[PDB]
Structure formats: structure tokens, C-alpha cells
Amino acid sequence: LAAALAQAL
């Protein structure tokens, strides 16, 4: 999940 969101940055 972290990566799925972190892709924004």
C-alpha cells in the first residue's frame, strides 16, 4: 500500500 500511494512522489 505504501508504494501504491508513494508513487505520487
Ligand SMILES: *C(=O)c1ccc(-c2ccc(C(=O)OCC)cn2)nc1
Ligand atoms: C503497497 O503498495 C504494498 C506494496 C507491496 C508490498 C510488498 C510487501 C512485501 C513484498 C515482498 O516481496 O516480501 C518478500 C518477503 C513485496 N511487496 N506491500 C505493500
Ligand SMILES: *NNC(=O)c1ccc(-c2ccc(C(N)=O)cn2)nc1
Ligand atoms: N514518487 N516517486 C518516487 O519517489 C520514485 C520514483 C521513481 C523511482 C525509481 C526507482 C528506481 C528506478 C530504477 N530504474 O531502478 C527508477 N525510478 N523511485 C522513486
Ligand SMILES: CCc1ccccc1
Ligand atoms: C514508486 C514508489 C516510490 C516512490 C518514491 C521513492 C521510491 C519509490
Ligand SMILES: Cc1ccccc1C
Ligand atoms: C517508502 C515510502 C513510504 C512513504 C512514502 C514514500 C516512500 C518512498
